[model samples]
Target chain A: PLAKALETISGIPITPFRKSDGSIDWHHYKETVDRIVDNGIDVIVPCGNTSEFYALSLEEAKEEVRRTVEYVHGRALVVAGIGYATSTAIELGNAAKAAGADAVMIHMPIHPYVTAGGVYAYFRDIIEALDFPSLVYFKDPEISDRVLVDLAPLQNLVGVKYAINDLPRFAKVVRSIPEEHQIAWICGTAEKWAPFFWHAGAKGFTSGLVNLLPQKAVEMLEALRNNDNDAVWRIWEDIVPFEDLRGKYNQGNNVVVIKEAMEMLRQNAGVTRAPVNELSNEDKQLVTELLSSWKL
Target chain B: LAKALETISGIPITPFRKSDGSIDWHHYKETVDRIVDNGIDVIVPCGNTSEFYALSLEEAKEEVRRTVEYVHGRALVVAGIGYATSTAIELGNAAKAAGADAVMIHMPIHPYVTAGGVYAYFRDIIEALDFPSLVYFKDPEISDRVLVDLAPLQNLVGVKYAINDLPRFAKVVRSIPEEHQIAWICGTAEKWAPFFWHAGAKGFTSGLVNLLPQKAVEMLEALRNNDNDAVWRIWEDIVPFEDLRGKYNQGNNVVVIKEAMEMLRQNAGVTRAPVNELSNEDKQLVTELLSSWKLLQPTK
Candidate 1:
């Protein structure tokens, strides 16, 4: 049931912050989450990249997962994002399980000196320790597909969030695995590449745009589900501008655009943490104009 | 008198307990004492050698605070700070509050790190903190322009130049305008320190200090006096040990240090995952290396 739910749109929600202390605004968070669940976002991914997973402290990340799980109240499936060292990732995964999260999306190895064996061991330790449903969040294109194939046999690994844009490699990785593992190939990239990814072998795609505009994401998901290529292109065209802006600066603006959209929509778009700055006035104007074009 | 530091910066390894695998503060204090008492000019806690990313926020801060308490001004204490900009900022604040001399910002491991973003990341941390900040430049992708831009920050003191390319290091060292005061430090420890020093690096970072600080001190002194013969002698003696640490694309970097410490009868317990324990053969070699140094008992 959870795997089937994962086959549709997985909404990675943006973290709403308080203007005063720059803390997470749980008050406004509920409203945003309410919109996501009500609009039929299949899964709620908190503490994701869109949620600034690394920026958040471990305690904050645990609390974020706990709160999301409590507030959603089975309204949507919640896959908490967990990463850092093996001990901490396991700690966070266990925390997520205890918090009633459905599964965990393990972030890629941020360690500078990661080997294939090391990467495999890192994921295996967490998956085996947690003994709960998990998703491998594979980001680096340089990593061998064999790592994914090696990971397929783990009983708890339900899916893979393949973030690399290389479709050939994606297809190779997907096909390399035996079908008996029943691993769900999730397009870790958001909407722009979903069609290509869907055609390649992805059963579902992740989205940051779902935070602000859930109906539109659902529109694209439904179209893709019904094999309506024309409608898929229509929705894709409508959101390409926003995604283009997000993809700029090596995707440095990824979270900025999402939060700015939240503010534009009159929701609580709290201040972005450092390293990730607020959007420039020119870019802000572009967002405003784009929203006008979308009639949001 | 360079405005920033130009001395051996010793990065201590975090010792975990044999019992519970938690950080052993008793062993940690002893480790810091060994580094400081042996003439290391700067002692950096929570560094990459200390498994910086492996530590949680509370544990990292406690490590820094304890280092400060134990050092008691015997040597300069610089806390290792990294991760997201805000997270680094929080650590910098905590380090300053804990009375650390400065904070060494580890290279940003975050995805989507661009030159401009890297500059902003370092700049925000430097600006946000009151004391000096050093950039751990392991990634060559962080452009010289970013360093040039960051040089103007009053608190931005040094760049821990870790990349092995000497030409680029030479170029980067020269690129900073003469008006700015930034120390170019060798970040690859003793193996590359001499080369980096020749390329105009004023100081060097050392994991070797966690084991043998006197050799690093001797190396620094030799380089300072331009004593080439003495420098080569010290480098030759240390090369076997350093070479072992450099194996497997440096997969055993931390393991070698911990193993050597264990061989020396220090409780520098096992490393966490992604960084595994050394093999029996590697451990045997480490024993031999330690025996050569006369830091361990020789086999009969």
Candidate 2:
């Protein structure tokens, strides 16, 4: 499964794009991917939350996965996010595997009437539907511990992205499960609570900062691995301002902030689509100042 | 008081329109009179349930004015006043000028950052017009904290709790001052009415009542009289039909209701395009439901 592959590569869980705007600029996509490759990213995941997979049609998602796989060209383990309301997730998952994605990461279905039993059915159905191995995304905090326990038996389910940040609960769940279960648990918070998560038995962490600051992310991950608390704190404090800016941008203008930051970096990813607000002039100015100060 | 409009079941008037998409004034007047005659206690024109958003400003004003005039004070007229800030205020004032008994302002589509801003927006509209107003608190995402903060405003009369989130609705109901006389109406009708009323909701808004006024009144009377078994019986019969109407499409809510009216031989005609025409299957389903219920039968 992709989660197992992810663990083998390192603890990096790939960020999926949401495709919120319904359009993907291949130019911007190539730029982002090329930069990640150039900066020595250990693993890459496309079509995750950052890709806005929800807003994209099946054909578009397939195209995105194909493009990302071709660009990576075996440089890193490329995981593709596949989950949707319709049967489109199967098509995307197959395409990702065909396009040379190491494995497919499956998100929890967001549709109503998706009970734990139904969720278990969803995974079983999807895994059976596709020949490829898959990773189960445990992002929703609402899923019961019993459901999580039930999921451990799925043979092809390689790993769990334990995105739910409650460490003690996460730790308890992990401890109860057999180590030979072959499920890799990666911290989904990009290392915000990595120290606690690591103590609680997370294998590694996902990093959204890899989009621009790959070296810093790698250094922090290494420090965490080595238990270099002082060095980790130093790196964390250095990126605190950038993280603060990212947090602020998510306040109302979620997609807009990211798109605006892309513009600030001269990536010029274009305007965010409607129903999501654009960055205010004040916010844009703040982003500009933050980017300049960070030399990002 | 506007509280009466909230407590009593009301009919969502179907906007009468010509084939060319213009307001058919005569047809509209006839529909309003039919709705009133069907035994609906309060008549609500220009509601979301009425396709008020799809109508032009002139059409909405004409519907409100003509319906109010035709009702002739026989029944309470609660004109739906929904739009952006200035536009809603203008509509509210116009509904007053047109002789509506009250105006129900649908909450703003895009919420402002603060409850204070929302309070000021509603206050400005109320202060601009003499007519009393009911605030449609449809968005469940708006916290009970915000509603409590806004509850003290003088001109506000009632709240239409849309999603029927009972716990939050209870908080909003208990927080308001008793003498302020705010009515908590279940906006999520039929399915939620029992639960909502159980949580102290006085009444519910009904879109189905537009076509089946007697059924609406019966349901409300059952709730009012504390006939729990009877309410569920009526609900069990109606829920399947309600669920069918709700399943048509995302925003086809009003369109589906209007189509059901058309199927009943009310001949309200098709809704505007972009809402899309009802598929053969949906039309057939509506036909079967109405036929089985004998709603198409002529009555004295």
> Which one wins on lDDT?
1
What's each prediction's TM-score?
0.82, 0.55
lDDT of each: 0.84, 0.66
Model 2: per-residue Cα lDDT over A1-296, one tens digit each: 44545652232222223346235577767777776766757677776655545434456667888888887787787778887522456767878888888778787664322334445666766777786677777755655656667767777777777777787789899988887777787776564656567778876666656665577777877788788989988887776655565455222243355567766776635653322335668778987887777777
Write one digit per residue (lDDT tens) for candidate 1, span A216-242. 899988899899999999999988898
Give the lowest summed-lDDT range of ten residues in model 2 chain B.
Answer: B109-118
What value does the interface RMSD of model 2 take? 12.4
User: Which candidate gets the maximum DockQ versus the true structure?
Assistant: 1
Task: Output the TM-score of candidate 1.
Answer: 0.82
Worst-scoring 10-residue span by lDDT in model 1 chain B: B109-118
Query: What is the iRMS for every candidate structure?
Result: 2.9, 12.4
Off by over 4 Å in 2: A1-5, A8-22, A244-254, B1-300
TM-score of chain A of 1: 0.97
Model 1 chain A: worst 10 consecutive residues (lDDT sum)? A109-118
